[model samples]
Target: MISYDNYVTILDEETLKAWIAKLEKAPVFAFDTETDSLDNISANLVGLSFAIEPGVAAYIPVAHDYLDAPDQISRERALELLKPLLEDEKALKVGQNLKYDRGILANYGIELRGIAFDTMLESYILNSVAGRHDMDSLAERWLKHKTITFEEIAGKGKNQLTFNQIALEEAGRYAAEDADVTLQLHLKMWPDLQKHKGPLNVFENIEMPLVPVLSRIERNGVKIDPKVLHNHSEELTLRLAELEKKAHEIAGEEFNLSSTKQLQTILFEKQGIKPLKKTPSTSEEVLEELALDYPLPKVILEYRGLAKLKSTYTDKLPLMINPKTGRVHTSYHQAVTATGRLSSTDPNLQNIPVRNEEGRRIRQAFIAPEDYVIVSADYSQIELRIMAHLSRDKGLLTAFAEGKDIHRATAAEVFGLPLETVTSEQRRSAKAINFGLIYGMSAFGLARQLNIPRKEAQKYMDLYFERYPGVLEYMERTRAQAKEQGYVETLDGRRLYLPDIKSSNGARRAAAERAAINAPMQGTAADIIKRAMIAVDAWLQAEQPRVRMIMQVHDELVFEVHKDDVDAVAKQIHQLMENCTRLDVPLLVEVGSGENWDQAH
Candidate 1:
């Protein structure tokens, strides 16, 4: 055991190897890594800090060129020594957001496998609604000290040198401090996890092991077509400008099309139009409603329209193209979401416009690279299927089993009509209710979506629930369970804490209530797909398959496949995804293959 006060220098290979030799015997250790930045792909490891029980800590510099030589050779040897510690089942490795560290390590051909504990995941599962999971945030709350951020030490610049490049003494101090902070964080968080019997076990047992899996997948990023995305960017700019002009003509004024404040004044105050609902927190909603209510206030509507067109659709998305592969690469953030669903940012590929003509046009931007076809596999009605199994709602189950259109089935029940006689409008309303119920939507939401009276929408919801009483029961039961346990878990044991279930604020509590209603269904689907991905990846690696798992949106997985093995790979993907989870109804998978993701879907 090493003493906390004893400074361990890792300027050379001998020290690093010796340090690893010592740690191999320790039962538990605190570990962390310093990276250049979150956004850069070429950013190499700057430093690695590990602390064993009884407070022995060592900071190893992997960044400096000197460390790269005799020292670098030793550091790699040390990493090999530590590999077993990470992957071994007996050793307990604790860290905050260890997923990134694992990913970086995997990039260096090191696979981190072992019994792991992630402070970030634990804190999230313990009390996600508290909204404080950052290591520094936890340190402040528990240790009463501010942890230093990377920006403070290295300063923010591209292509910065690794920790080894710094003066040996400075490198040692910086690296050692990280180990100290992580050690304190782990010590502080471990006890809290024990105190709260919420989702801590789920984090330790289920989510932690998956970190290395996520890292491996991220390192194997998907392919893209930069030229196609660029062309689409140009096309969207021209189309957006046309729309802006048309809107200006309708409004009879010219103004900045991007300013929300200006649009608010023009639509609400200047046009004297009333909103459908009172503004909540911000006045933007009031302005939006006013613009919609009065067609004369076109500039505001145009501004809103153009802003989404540029940011969410055109400008930001086109830039997301990966410079190396000439394709857009979106990071799948595993820990960022509270509901356990994977969310994509840096172009948010999951939310690309798909319903409207403008949105559909955006799909054209994503073209397949030369000689590679995009094979897309999406779970069909995955959430609803999970809901059906969970709720045991005979009506939903029967509908799914019959392979009938679920919306039409719902319409017939809600409207008390035969399936053959269900009109398009009724089917649309039923579809809205099907989705909205999962979200705990109000009568107002239903009315707006269905274009019906609020009372009628309320009645429709009542009728729908009356027809499928089991769904209502499941929702209430899960919500009660969330309130009682202060957390909820899926069938597979993926857990999420709902602290706001005990909140004093009505809005906050309601939001948590919705999460309680939705988390099990959505989270389970997420878990199933993730497991499938891991399974499929393992199969491909073992078989030496050529296809690569690229982009993952919620419920969908996109792959870039060689033309020769496309059929076989598609079959393998479909089988694995479908067989990943068994519900009352078969897990339906819709498979499509084309030159681009849009075409595949």
Candidate 2:
């Protein structure tokens, strides 16, 4: 290990230039950026760090501003000298979540290139079900070494200092340790990853390539209309107030609507409404059931929904817009979900509801610039189609081939009726059953979903399996394989490790079985979308279209395209997405365009 005295903090131009020279010649190295803020768009580079080997590392302080902070090279001088080495296409670089670093570097007019491995993605591609892939977590898991946490050196809470404000003695070691640990993690995991061709392929092809694409999407961000959101917020507040008033009228007394304690008393003690289940809870599920028989609970449910929309979206989104970019940037997490799906945080764009009016209204705030249109393109019945592809069920394949309404087709098959004769009621049940199978829903779940007797739900399940026996067989094969091998795999070879696949406890085992059945379909769908994003990114870079990909929410990709190129761009994107992967069933992308996100959908 390099001693503290030799762990170079590049304080002079001579030392920085020498370090850059060494970096240019190193075959592979780990790189990281120390920033003043967590927001990639707004973060000012505090310093740059690199590790050429397991233990040898350096930190070039660029903008440390604390009192008596050691004299260092200017940020401009350091970045200018570092630009060539960082941008060299053939020079391999490794890091932990380099996506954030790339975004940060891009802000300084340096497009970070030559990214070979991200330890975060490497850990994720190996086992998504394992613990978090953050630098601190990865260091402990892979190297069994505790890396210096920011909180340790910078204090805690509001008193905590940013990297630039922390003393060089503390910040330099912390920053250099990040690069050192990242390289160590890569070295430890890469050999094990290479032993498994499936996971290695995913690591190299899907996860790594998609990192830059996600960074670009995050930086492009969606332009939001604060005015639209503000108006919606006012209306939502009014609606919530009305609902509260209605609740008070029904109860003949006032109570805090959001307070579960008040709710339980009002429902149980005041109204004498019997609790549905044994647990004395006023959770969403409990309220949903109670709402069916009681007016107060129904009003409370409405209040809760609108209140959340007000706080989470309508009121909060406008405030989240980046002033410099004039857009809302959402950070996408690649290593979070167990099924390899991407999730967004810091104003999650994915969880915003499309099924309800207020939620749809929230989408209206996501608008394009004056001459551009928001193009929303989403895969239709993506997971179900993946199910058909994986299971190779004849009925599903035929239904997709015939271009029939899939839910109606399922209804016709399960109910022993013709597709044309299937009622809307039957199709609704079929929709739930079709989606239910993907999640490995049991008869009890189906009964609860459809409000039917458990016996009838079981009969429906039997009828479904009888008709789509191939799906049942595929699921059975998957469960056995998972139990035998401790994992299931997506079509693109991304493994979903099921640690509890053979658990002694029935509930845990059943859940793992459900995940085993669902992961491949969900993971494959995730893989397909990622590949599509990669292809589209490459094409956009080559063609130089007046279009920008702004958001990726599961199966959908949202773009802002110039009005002149809307038709051609949308068609091209659809083709690119469909052609990204070959499946047994044809992939379909439903494209819509308008001034705002809701209209575009």
Candidate 3:
């Protein structure tokens, strides 16, 4: 543990200004914010901490309002003193998951520039599956020290104190230790990361620049119409009730629809439905399979789907709107996924369904303001394009290069038919094969997906490999590389380390091999989108257009653009996104604009 006695409490403006001077002269420093809440838009700034050298730090308590709390520099004075250093481009900063701190500081009108490194992202880029990248965990793993936890200073559960309520002695030490440990961890990890060109490139080029872009997108949250959401919720309520009634009717009795045990009994015992490869469980996959041959399971599946939509989206999004911003803010997490894809929470805007009508209707609530229209731009068949590049498959490259329908081209090739003669069903099957192969799907999985015999699935697989020999070679090469190196790299050099690539257990190793095949394509797609974001953000900052990027789901970026500037801005955005990176196959972006999200898509 770091000695608390070495840290200082900045209680006056003179101390803060002097430290700011020192920080301005320092090449790099670590900083953190003590906030009243985790939600950035609503979180109140309680204090700020900074560490310039290992084992030395300072905390400025701005809002410690507990009884007999020592006099401290006011929040405004502290920020005023620290603004130049925080915003200076040359005075670099390092921290763990700097995005959160950046966002929190943004609430106070600070832009938080010059982020030279983020310890969390460094750990993630270095080896995603190694361990958790939080401050305490990183400290223990990298620094061989157990830093004080939040619970140690703030207590736990219902009686926990916010930073402002804790005494200066405890709060200052805990807070300063955060910055000190962050600096130490950076010192410990940066040189190690610097040893690898791939991870270093990913960190410097894609991940670091993306921190502020995500912070901006998170702050410029999307608008949702509560009236529309409420209406959708009511309609969902009626339909869900209908689905429940139909389910009960099919089951010939009323039971708890949400209860798995009751559902299993009603399905297997009462309905006389034979268990399909019994597990004594009623999972969604089982229900989906049973839905093909059973009425009750079909109804139950519909009921469950509607219930999930209601609970996850319509009934939830309206309440998620930040009262301060009048928009739903979702936090984009960079360190969560092994493949470098960003996942969001707090009304996870990424996973909202776009296929079904109910899901589309839910999207209707994501409306534009009066003068602005929603503009959605998404890369077309990004993963497929990535596959073509990674595999160097001549067929895929030619198809994409000629701007042909890839699935249709694949169908023609696989079926030994002319391109114009390919049927829609053939194209659909080819589409599944094309995507399924990228995921390293086996013959059994393909058979289940296509509802065909295993032999037929095997034939399709063999034909696919025969038709695209380069893809087969690529898969084999990737598996061998993963087994040898225990890691795979995206196009931009983000490493997805497979700790189980050489495991003794066949299943784990097989799964790792599959991931070895998929991670490059998926992670490259993630890298491309991040690059696009950074480029677009730079353009937005330079041009100062009347546009705001609000959401990023998969390969798509949603923005709010003034109706008058839509045509020009959309064109620029399309150009920027499509040309974000170079690939063997051209990147294509599809752009649309409408008053609501569904229509925009």
Candidate 4:
């Protein structure tokens, strides 16, 4: 157990064939790859490793080039021999991050079949708050042993050797240990996961199946209108220029817009505007708050907004397109966020703003192919509905039940006005109140945001609670529970342990209390959406292959549907999303369509 002495190095074709025959009948197998590089799409496959039983593993070197290394089976012959075993439906395959391995398999035009456990995801489900979930950390934390690390043999930093360049014997031991460790971890985790039914449901029913679904979507990618994005880029450049000129005029001098020091001097030192907030090191959030009252800050805010849109989306997305696919693919992560929410990178489509026209136009570049239409189906007021369910608030429940505009209904209740007489301003205020409470915003916080007097905000809060007493009760209960348990949980039982919930420090404890009240609702919504994605992906695969689900941005799922099948397919998507899970309050989903994503919304 201390060493890889049990590991077999399959350097010859005959040994690989025999091992393949042995693995064919095994009920479960652990699999891992040794690659020349990290880029799954184009990296060279150096070797394949497998473990058919506990503490036993083998590595078949396919493309090793080290001097004096033994002759190994050719890469083509190895993959040819391994394909059927890898794709066999009878054998359960386990790995660390199976999604990554799945991507590498895709590079070879192989779909990893009968996929079972991912130790990385399992550990995440059991305790997301644990500092790490990577295999090395897991081995140390769970098994109380340290496996051989890659850096020991390959070295590190700029001089790190690719797997292919390493000695065959050295590479074999490392690769085999990965498969061995993954198998043993799976054995350890599978029963432990089943005992935690809540996370088990999430892992097996939601997260596991979604791996391949996301893999397909990532491969499918989203078509982009580069011309439209370029046009938007030009407009953004012009807008940034205008804002820059205005900022200089307001400052009574010119300065480098990107330099925080120069901007700090002009805003704080030269103008003597008095500090709205300090910029000593961190300044962006303060700048946003100051933008409301100060002219230069406002102009600078405008400049920064346009610049970010240009950088993150309009100017960047087109350049991110894969030449092979003519589309941009984003990597989806299931285990990153404390809440069950999925996060993304490679043109962070999740954080793309949808509030302003610039944001909408940036989304407009996410286009469908010639004969397809972009279909967006978003959960309508999901978190608010969740809040109503959690709080059991009659006002919220009835409004949602009667199909009344929720914010307007809230305005009528909170302001003591008739529902019909609720003004636009009242509705807007009510909207803030509803979401503000969901986010655990204080009266002072709300007052600062709405630019109203603190007394008015306090009165509004008092009135809101008086109108919906259960909401206040729910908040109190959540906070108390968090202090008691040191964790909060979604309805589905995904746990988020707040580190500072019972702290002596007032501010830290208060922040943790806010997280307590807010996290369950957010996490439940995240769980629901994940469930919806799984169910929707299943249906699309089984009955509607023409409908290609392309992106999942928060509560919304985007799809590229063949124009002929748009209407029929859209109805299914909406109904499926709404009925994905049962809640006390009915889930409502809004579906829309267009040539591009913005219009689709």
Candidate 5:
């Protein structure tokens, strides 16, 4: 009934009522938000935009407090009028990236329901590698329309304006067009998504339900001990000074330890250590290799490691705590990765080091509040378990079925020894091989990791294939399929297309082949954890609100649980994660708990 190119100027009560009446009866509609900031917690809701039909949208400016702007309905009245339609479960709401909207809406004391379709996820579920699932990307590629960008309307850099600060006319048009464009994109992609049952199933079942779950987790915001982080920061500062002093002594000259250029000069020029590789870049990996024969490189490695630990974690994490919530809120991104894995940013919780002793101290600051414990429930060798399920190799399956040490089992087979006789050193090599090959590591690469002869590494690989022939077969088959079809898929039907699979360039195609080999197992593992997250979130919402899912890192879920209820909660969480999917090899969940994250693990 309406096509408002500059947005429906609902200045009076009659137009607002009429539009609400029209939207109420629709089975599905597109929705979007205009917010003052990217942070969901602190962002001011500038307006809400809606589209009941393609190329038709309305922007109701509720919080446009700019001087000389036309009078609009107050924020309370607009949400009060709109909340009914939003809560109507029968009326599905569609948008591009509705998760951000849901989180933003929650800040306004509104719980958004009927979130059915996300065009962002729609394109992702269809073909993850086509391009980015951002609204601009989706609208241009799929809908053949270029929507106005936020930067264009808001200006850029230091002079950029918030939605509330932008003149009402510009804000209304930009916000309304976002909703209109999203509806148009959904119209283009939905049929193709439904035509293929696999992606549709994955979208409807996994990604769709997960939107609100991640939103809630993001909003809950983990309680952190900033005091502990400050202490750790101070400690790291002293250690950094010590390291810098040692490095200067080792170099026989004072230099900026943080400067890779300075370190590069000291290592190859002044110290007279031959450059092992041809790259100008100096990284920890290169330093470690150089350290094999040089005392100076070893010292530099230690110096760089502690410096990174200080700068990236201890010094950074405490600064990120949201003052309103007094907690650190990490943003979870669903469409960032090709393998359906969720990535995090804004104080990336995933990037916090866990394996090393010094880095593990960062977890000490990730404390649960009083009377609660940090619960870490991790999928044990989840990718390897997926490899077993995919390969269907008797040896791999039997090892899993018997619940034996998988790496040791691999060692026993590859080394041609009994399981009891498999040495820890041999098992370490096998462990490297098992995870290494899944990532498409060559024998030469494996040799480098295991510090062995290339021939011996190749022999181990041959023996591994002899024992688990189906794995090799599966790898070959997946490579062929990806090359032929220019895509790979997860077990749950999520497709990741590699356009370079058939490239004439050898390096590009070979990289594609490696990705092709790794995608399914890694992708399926991502899919499985996502499925578990959905189920666990549902259970927590329905039954146990006291236990909150605080973090998701790779193949694990971290939780904060009531101290008295840890056993019951951990049991259910473990069971939910293990049964998230049924596989040939039984899924195993390793659960642990303590006062903080490192202790929990």
Candidate 6:
């Protein structure tokens, strides 16, 4: 057996090879990587940390200076060592967000395959509502100790020596501490997760396996057009200046547009508008509220409109495009959300404006490379379909199976109008109720979104239940489950534990009640799409296709395909997504294709 202190420096070929050989024989081990930056693309591997059973640990540094002309024989030996460990099907590989480490390793032609355990995914399945999921958070929760931050050892700033450049003793301690903490988190959470077996099993069996799948997809990045992105940046810059000028003229004074405090004072204090106390007191909120109030003093309303155009869209999007690829690469956070839906940041691909003309114009910037096409596939009415399946509501299932427009059908039923006579206005109201009722949304919430009176919103909801009684039953059953079991699960058994459902506070308890009602439906849909991604990825590889999954925003998957295989790949992707999960209601997938994500949608 090897000892931790025996090989502090993994610079030699024989020592690294021996370590790898020993690790293969071990049943389980801890693994993690130290990156150069928190920004995924910009970061480089500083060191690789691993620990075997019986408390032996090692940190193998890979600093740029040392790795600039890295010893080839030693490097090949290290790769060969890693190959078996990664490929071992029975060996459990534990790490925090192993997808990233797996992705970076893939860049070096490494394919990490094993019985992987992600501490992050495990914690999320156990308690979805918790805020933090980093190693520091896990250490505090499980081990009751703090690991050293990279900033302290490497020194803060862009151009500093990395952890690999630090003294070997210090680097080993830091890297080894990370591996140790990860192991502790796994040991502590494993029993708790097993106790709450439903969602935890789905996470382990389904979600964790997909991490390497996602890493492979991300590694095969979408091709982009630099000239188009640059052109869009220039146009956006000019448009932002024009909008800013218009906003100033409307506000009747030149004020700093970026200052939230100043904007709040201008709208609420100076103008004597009675603002809602609960609303966020940010400039963005102040302006949005001003626009919503409608028939506001013309000057203030115009200022609100122009300021939104300038800040939310015109000025922000151009800065989002990556200079390297000349395309925006939004990071899909895996475990950040309480619900299973993926959230996007940097460019926030999820919240790309779709409502108005100006927001729609921004889609032109997300162009594909020459001769390539972007294919977008989205599940149609996915949440409602999940709800129909879980509730087994005959009316809902019938509506979907018959290919009826769900919103219009709902409007006709609720408003007591014939299907042929259901007005667009009534359909819109029913649509709001359909979405709102799923989350236990109150009349006030629906009213605000639909620009209707609270009483009218309440009436619409009552009528909705009158039309579909089974939905009401499902909601009550799920909420009761949350209260009794302290958790809820989807059809596929993905669990969301709601500890706060039993909270003493009225508001917290009520929010948890809402989550209980919504989690199963939304979470189940999330599970279905993820399964589809895994299937589609495997099929693509088997067929040796050039198409690659670039981004996943909620129910949609965006792909960049070679011009030749666009039709064949788009059809296959649509079919795979639609069939990922079978429900009482037929799952429909809408497929669109164009040169950029915007046009495809």
Number of clashing pairs per prediction, in order: 8, 0, 0, 0, 0, 1
Tens-place lDDT digits, model 4, residues 257-312: 65346777777775544544443323125566666666776777677777877888
Candidate 6 per-residue C-alpha lDDT over 356-384 given as tens digits, one digit per residue, 9 for 90 to 100: 55556566666677888888899998999
Off by over 4 Å in 3: 1-4, 258-273, 276-286, 290-293, 583-585
What does the lDDT read for residue 571 in candidate 5? 91
**Per-residue lDDT tens digits of candidate 3, residues 129-177?**
7888788888889878898899998999999988789988788889999
List TM-scores for all candidates, in order. Answer: 0.85, 0.95, 0.96, 0.91, 0.95, 0.87
Model 4 segments more than 4 A misplaced: 1-6, 24-27, 65-70, 150-160, 258-273, 277-294, 583-585
What tens digits encode model 1's per-residue C-alpha lDDT throughout 301-342? 554554577667666665665565455556766667877777
- Give the CA lDDT, 0 to 100, for residue 597 in model 1: 68
Q: Which scores better on TM-score, 4 or 5?
A: 5
Off by over 4 Å in 6: 1-8, 39-43, 64-76, 88-91, 157-160, 222-327, 583-585
List model 5 lDDT by residue over 1-601, tens digit each. 1134556756666788898898888768999988888888888888988999986788888877778888889888888888888877787999989999998888777889999999999998888878888999888898677888888889999989888888777877788899888998988888889877778888999999999999988988888898998888888888878877887887677878543467677777855545443333432256667678877777766777777788888888888999999999998999989889999997787777768887688888889999999999999998998898888888888898899999999999888899999999999999999998789988878888877888899988998898889999999999999988888888888888888898889999888989998999888888888889899998987896579998998788999999999999889998888875655446999999999998998
| Candidate 5 off by > 4 Å | 1-6, 256-273, 276-286, 290-293, 583-585
Model 5 lDDT-worst window of ten: 275-284
Q: Give candidate 2's whole-model lDDT.
A: 0.87
lDDT pick, better of 3 and 6: 3
TM-score of 4: 0.91
Each candidate: what lDDT?
Answer: 0.70, 0.87, 0.87, 0.84, 0.85, 0.72
Worst 10 residues of 6 by lDDT: 276-285
lDDT of 5: 0.85
> 145 in model 4: Cα distance from truth in Å?
3.3
Worst 10-residue lDDT window for candidate 3 reads 275-284
Two-way lDDT contest, 1 vs 5, winner: 5
